[PDB]
Design a protein around this ligand. Structure first.
Ligand code: FDE
Ligand code: FDE
Ligand code: FDE
Ligand code: FDE
Lengths: 451, 450, 453, 452
């Protein structure tokens, strides 16, 4: 009872050239604004539907009708993340297995344990920024990346990257960044066999070895003893099959966590810092809460949760630019979406989170303005209207940890510094598969409080 | 005595790679934002200084200290616009000659003369928008180009480009456009002799030929009309008694054609953008238009009384002045602002968009579209607002442009309600001028007839 | 029974294999590696490349196979339309134009074109006389000026005046660029990517350029009624015996484009190649120059005299054997059939004759296939049937074979009569490939023998 | 002064630099020489040089009392990872004459007898690889010559086993070297080396030097764990004026130097010979003839390698037509006049186009392009300085005897054991790094069924 909108198609190439930007997500957003809540996007070999209104999004988040689909994006990341929690299909050996082995390791009770090491990495950042000279500035995404990676490596696997002791990035991080870019780059390749991509292929494998070799370096330090993320993997057993996780799979989970945490949380903080320096009154409300609550030289686990405004900023940043901008679904059985669009079994849907988070119908007509005050009552927001961490059983396992980190770090930054948008930086959002601000720089004057 | 800041330089290429964007002006504004009111900009074989605070620009506008310089930009334009007014040196032969011959034709008294022909073109645009079907949209920069170009050919030269009767741009307009891109592109070539730049060198001569050709049919076909073109054929220099030679005239026509259509097309487009982005201001101007434009066709008198429409235009050109910069050189040794010593011949660049963002002058809300700043146009300090250049070398076409945009904007506001149906994000395309790219709207006609 | 096929790249088949600027030569190397036949697959199409006289002989059976419009020719049809070269044998305008024009390329017709042919030829000789001592000759560039001017004057009584220019006629640059675009579409897997927008639009403008002067020439003569006895009046006045009607204006415009392109592209390459092999084989140059001197006894050559340069004709034939400027033609099986007892073909299957490789079939030419020996052709009937097909086959064979040979023989004769040629650069053969073949950096210096015209 | 020197087409401030914007610079300089003759000026943005091609001028330029070895722009770029090694050092630099006198013993004819055995080891591995191929397959000639030449210099020279024949994608070191060498050539064409577009290139290059210094600098320690080899001569030899052995970092520069120069020159050299053999079947016959007659043991003897006279002649005739290191550079020690026609300021640069020298028609006769190895039957008939494939003077190629022995040995064994088919009718295509090798050259080989 409704023909679905579709953008300009270029011959046999369908809609693919339309996402021949350096900014595909943002290109999909611009399409969403022109065609409305749902549009078909077909490329050679695949077809999908992108949804942008909460009315259709809530139905797709009905777990009896739709199951998580591996988007072409995720299908290409699977070539180095394999059977990890992020890139495994729901119905498959290790998803449920790893899911129940690892879920205890991220429940609110796990956070109390990670808190000490999180603080460690957070002081290094504060000390680095403290120790900068006057004429210097801060490269925000890079230092957030230094932070996030160091924090997961210590909390999760008790491995010290020492990112703050390095100027050129780590070999691992560069391979991870190059691998993700390649996964993205395969989306626009109309035929991946063309010889033009031979060097691109050769490097892809060279970086997969670099990561896969290095992760086993993490494994060497232990069997050759501490309440940590890795221990649960080598040591937790399935209640039905009795076994632990395979050595090959434990690998993929590590790659997954390293990639997921360091990438998603880097954008998150950077965006929060971006929005703070652009909204100085919000900064004021957030900076004062920092001083009043963070009364110790270093924070305690209990003190973090009181930062009720710092948390609101983070959520409001994540509303506007969700660092994992999309998740994919398929129909378990034949169905009708919204009484208008019939779906055959196996058809793919794409939830375009940033555009869902821009539904005026839900948020009012100031969808675009950075106002953390929307979130004082998280309970007024309808169901499936704010889904930055996915949905259902395949929802983000790393939510409670990421939020702990972001709120922790942001608090200490606001407690210890004031930040000047000394360049009048125009937001430039880089798209690998995640989103991050690119070239964001600030200067920070230390408030002269000791640690 | 104050040492001047300079951004990052790359070996023998100096600051040249920093502008290896498709957006140099915008990249320079970014540099201005990091380095402050003035910075030195070095390229291979050249040096200039970019000024951004009203403190420095006011000095540089002393016609006793500084004269108009042909920036590297304009030096490349001189290859197809030659010694026309825009691309002339002040003291060269044809400038003051041509300037004093033509000023009468851009005086306020000529406007009453052009007004009919201007209305003619504007009715065409309005009828084009009325005749769209419901599902269709409007391509704003492209239709402003049809409008601005057709307007000057009819007012100036009684030539009908018929852009509204065409879907791919006119062959003249496209070569004229491609010539501008090459002038810009020559800015970025570290060595223009490289054979990679040979296909370009060939297209360039063909485009110069295309425009030079079209003009000469207009100019020769004349040898009964009181317009810019006969003023050129008949105007006489009071010292030598002769008109401009046919070559210089050709150069004036080319100059005007591009200069008007490029700046005025961008300008109207920016106004439409800022209006759809601030609907109260659209409301007030729409209300103001409806009350004043009370006849089926607007009159010359009524256009001076679209006082709010004019304020909008002033506020848009404040934000994005479609001709974004002018250049100056020091006539003799001096110090600029007590801090920066300058040798004779040293170059200055007025970065008009950054000047219009000097919080010191405009307040702390610079980035806001508020036409009410232009209630009292006398309230604004001198040398704070330079959209039309400066001095004797200031835009000779200010009235005509202002008259044009104001007439056109008003009729659109009287005749349509406009929908930003795509939530268009501003993307400003750079030739040498500025212009929004991909700006589209939907327009529902108010069914007022013409 | 299973046919060789070169290396395939995923869903892209063999197409990346000849993403060179020189496809024919890459195909010549596939044939060298894989032999008399190999399958060449592209997205959406399949063809078989044949190189042995054994298979070509069957492929020339007009009762079994007909002329196919190769993918290449399919793209040329975008501006050569319904011209003789790009017509299907069963299309309406083919047989029509064919029976109408054949007299205009006959031998009695050549006697008529000869003088205007001579006209362009003196223009070439004088330009070469009037050069100063230091300069060289840009050989392909001057052969192009000559061949184009000759077809325009002989065919259409139109003067391009190429010798009075440095920028080629505005038209020939389009005509050349259209050919390059036609060639360029061969390697584009996705023809729709927006990157080919400047290409596809420049293309449409170049077609506008060619049609303008061709429709001007065809209209300008439909007013002066002038009885030049040339291709153009023969097209305007000749009538089809079945419909009683002459060729439509749209179709004539296509034959002109066809003839301008066909003559200028094939013959200039041909002359260029002959001259290359001559300056590279000085003993052969001597014999031809001697025959040139002995026969060209008049201030300007006469038609009877041209018949008589038997050795330059053998040179020309030996040149077109090594590098046939039009390197391939295509056929399809009119019905299901088996080729050479090993390869069954369904009706409609496409075959491609790789003429350069055919002309190197050692079992036919002997063990010295690559040496330039014009003495192979002094007994022309000794050559087996379908062993030497530089002009195609059967009813679809080149209509301009005679006209071209006359031009080349005449022109080459005069060059040898009037100059001594020096390979002052030791030019290494570098063959540019558009749709036809021609050498690229070829230059020589020529000392005038001071014989007058 | 008498004679204004020719100069090819100039592109404004970019001079004639665009003339070598091929992937085949050397071949372009030949095409220019063929039209402008025995000498021409070649200008670049920051430099000017003169190319010599006639034996007449080259005989003068090889006067060691007037000219010395210059570092061409090319060799200046190799100096970034080969540093102070013999190939990239100035004569008056402190490590040249130092390293030169300690190493001459390791390449004297006397030294060869020792290298002979390990030379054979790698030589059989190659023969075994070819023997074990199935019939439908072919031989990728440059790749297998690169495998051999590198394994031989690495084994015979430093007792390190690369084991190239046990891998299909090339060694990381060799892939890094070739990419480092490619970067050196790639710079020659950049009139803007500061431009940001070259950041990934500058990055990768810096990573590639680390790769070489990694393995090589480990090898110097890995031996301190002493036999009689090139590395031992470097670790143990003493300079008589300061009495010191070579610098630890200088040795790293020599090893890198020797690995590259050998593997790049010798592999190219063998490949070219094989091309000429399969293209000249009668020469192939006579060459396999002597091979069959002399190579009478399951393994070659040192004496026997010397007793191949025609195989050596094919080698000489191969390097004549395509000398794998095609050029060397010189500077004027003082002001002087070249050929009585061209005056030179002190410090002016000369480039010898060895391929063009080796085509000087007045010297070799008019069949200069023909592959005729019998030109080398009487080597004393060849004029002094007409045939300089190994450079000139004290700066002459130190390894020419090692190289000739390897090429003679290997080429001999190939001719004994296989018959070769140009089964694809391969057209000669020259890959240019700084050195010259042929590309995509392939043959099929039918075994003569003979054991080792
Ligand atoms: C470590 C970590 C950290 C994190 C964080 C984050 C942030 C900030 C954001 C986010 C997100 C997300 N996630 Fe996240 N995260 C993580 C993780 C993860 C994992 C493992 C996963 C998978 C799970 C399942 O489902 O199985 C996720 C998950 C996730 C999601 C979903 C996806 C789909 O496709 O559905 C989302 C949307 N994550 N996230
Ligand atoms: C027609 C026309 C129109 C116009 C418009 C306009 C607009 C809208 C804006 C503008 C601007 C300008 N201008 Fe303009 N305009 C014109 C023009 C002109 C001229 C001619 C000139 C030059 C002047 C003199 O000096 O003479 C100008 C001018 C001008 C200027 C200045 C330049 C310099 O460098 O100095 C500026 C800034 N404009 N504009
Ligand atoms: C005008 C002219 C001239 C010429 C020349 C020549 C030369 C030198 C060479 C040649 C060739 C040829 N052709 Fe040549 N030609 C011509 C033409 C022609 C035509 C029209 C054709 C088609 C035919 C029919 O079909 O009808 C030809 C044709 C021809 C051929 C065939 C085609 C196919 O596809 O088969 C060939 C191979 N052609 N050719
Ligand atoms: C081991 C080795 C091996 C070799 C080989 C060879 C071959 C096959 C060829 C050759 C070559 C040469 N080298 Fe030689 N080689 C070597 C080496 C060398 C050295 C070390 C050098 C340097 C020495 C001097 O001079 O000091 C050379 C050296 C050489 C030379 C010279 C360089 C210049 O710059 O002068 C030449 C030309 N190589 N090579």
């Amino acid at each position: 009872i409704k023909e679905m909108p579709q953008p300009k198609t270029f011959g046999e190439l369908k809609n693919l050239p339309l996402l021949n930007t350096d900014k595909p997500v943002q290109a999909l957003m611009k399409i969403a604004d022109e065609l409305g809540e749902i549009f078909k996007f077909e490329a050679p070999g695949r077809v999908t539907r992108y949804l942008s209104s909460q009315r259709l999004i809530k139905e797709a988040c009905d777990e009896s009708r739709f199951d998580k689909n591996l988007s072409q994006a995720l299908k290409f990341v699977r070539d180095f993340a394999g059977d990890g929690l992020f890139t495994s299909w729901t119905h498959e050996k290790n998803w449920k297995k790893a899911h129940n082995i690892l879920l205890p390791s991220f429940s609110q009770q796990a956070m109390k344990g990670y808190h000490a090491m999180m603080v460690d990495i957070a002081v290094q950042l504060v000390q680095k920024w403290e120790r900068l000279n006057a004429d210097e500035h801060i490269e925000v995404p890079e230092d957030m990346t230094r932070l996030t990676l160091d924090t997961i490596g210590l909390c999760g696997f008790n491995y010290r990257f020492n990112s703050f002791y390095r100027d050129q990035p780590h070999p691992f991080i560069t391979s991870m960044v190059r691998a993700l870019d390649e996964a993205m780059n395969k989306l626009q390749r109309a035929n991946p066999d063309d010889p033009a991509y031979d060097e691109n292929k050769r490097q892809f494998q060279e970086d997969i070895k670099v990561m896969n070799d290095l992760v086993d370096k993490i494994i060497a330090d232990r069997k050759a003893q501490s309440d940590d993320l890795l221990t649960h993997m080598l040591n937790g057993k399935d209640p039905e099959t009795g076994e632990p996780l395979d050595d090959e799979n434990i690998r993929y989970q590590i790659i997954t966590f390293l990639i997921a945490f360091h990438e998603t949380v880097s954008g998150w903080l950077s965006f929060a810092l971006y929005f703070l320096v652009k909204n100085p009154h919000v900064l004021q409300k957030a900076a004062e809460e920092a001083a009043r609550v963070l009364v110790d030289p270093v924070p305690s686990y209990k003190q973090v949760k009181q930062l009720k405004y710092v948390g609101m900023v983070l959520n409001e940043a994540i509303r506007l630019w969700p660092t994992a901008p999309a998740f994919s679904l398929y129909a378990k059985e034949d169905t009708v979406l919204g009484g208008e669009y019939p779906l055959e079994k196996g058809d793919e849907l794409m939830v375009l989170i940033p555009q869902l988070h821009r539904d005026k119908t839900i948020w009012g007509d100031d969808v675009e303005e950075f106002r953390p005050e929307r979130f004082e009552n998280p309970s007024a927001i309808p169901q499936h209207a704010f889904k930055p961490f996915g949905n259902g059983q395949r929802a983000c396992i790393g939510q409670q940890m990421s939020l702990h980190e972001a709120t922790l770090v942001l608090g200490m930054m606001l407690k210890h510094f004031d930040f000047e948008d000394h360049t009048n930086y125009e937001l430039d959002i880089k798209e690998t598969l995640t989103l991050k601000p690119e070239g964001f720089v600030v200067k920070a004057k230390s408030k002269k409080i000791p640690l």
